[PDB]
Amino acid sequence: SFSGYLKLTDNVYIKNADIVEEAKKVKPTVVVNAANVYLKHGGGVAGALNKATNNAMQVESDDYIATNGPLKVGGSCVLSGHNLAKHCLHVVGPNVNKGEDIQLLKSAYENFNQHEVLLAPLLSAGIFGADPIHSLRVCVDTVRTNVYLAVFDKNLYDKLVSSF
Numbered sequence: 001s002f003s004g005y006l007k008l009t010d011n012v013y014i015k016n017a018d019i020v021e022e023a024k025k026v027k028p029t030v031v032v033n034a035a036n037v038y039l040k041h042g043g044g045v046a047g048a049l050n051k052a053t054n055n056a057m058q059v060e061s062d063d064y065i066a067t068n069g070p071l072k073v074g075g076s077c078v079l080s081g082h083n084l085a086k087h088c089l090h091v092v093g094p095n096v097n098k099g100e101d102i103q104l105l106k107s108a109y110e111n112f113n114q115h116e117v118l119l120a121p122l123l124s125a126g127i128f129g130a131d132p133i134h135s136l137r138v139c140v141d142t143v144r145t146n147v148y149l150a151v152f153d154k155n156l157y158d159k160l161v162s163s164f
């Protein structure tokens with residue numbers, strides 16, 4: 001099970017950890033990917049999760065897009081977790097660096113409510129350009145299921161806990 005997490009609320013927990021290493025250790029039922037609408041896992045959390053699957057996540061993702069088309073910003077799909085988890089919930093938060101509406105961040109976090117427990121990053125943070133403090137606030141105020149957040153950056157983890 002999950003270990004070394006700080007409890008933020010009844011259902012939200014947080015740890016300074018690499019989500020790839022956390023997924024390999026825990027093998028959770030669901031790992032969340034910070035996806036884009038095309039499921040092109042080039043960089044950030046998505047690039048790191050995909051590289052850990054030896055590109056099997058990208059091959060499966062390309063078949064899903066060829067069949068279904070792109071996701072919506074704020075939407076999600078469930079695919080295999082490969083060697084990292086039973087399932088990967090690919091969730092698209094708004095990318096501020098591309099001009100997307102930040103109000104869609106709450107819709108993106110609502111996808112987590114379909115799963116009892118998840119290992120996840122903060123959506124729309126990092127290379128997606130949103131303020132991670134805002135993303136954690138929206139997470140706590142939207143998700144009702146058990147979420148284990150992994151924050152890679154130590155300095156950002158410390159700021160997120162101290163300002164919570």
Ligand SMILES: O=C(O)[C@@H]1CCCCCN1C(=O)c1ncnc2[nH]ccc12
Pocket residue numbers: 018019020034043044045048121122125126127132150151152153156
């Ligand atoms: O979790 C983090 O600290 C980072 C960076 C800023 C905060 C937002 C989340 N985030 C990422 O999206 C990320 N980006 C690229 N590679 C990564 N490896 C693990 C996480 C990760």
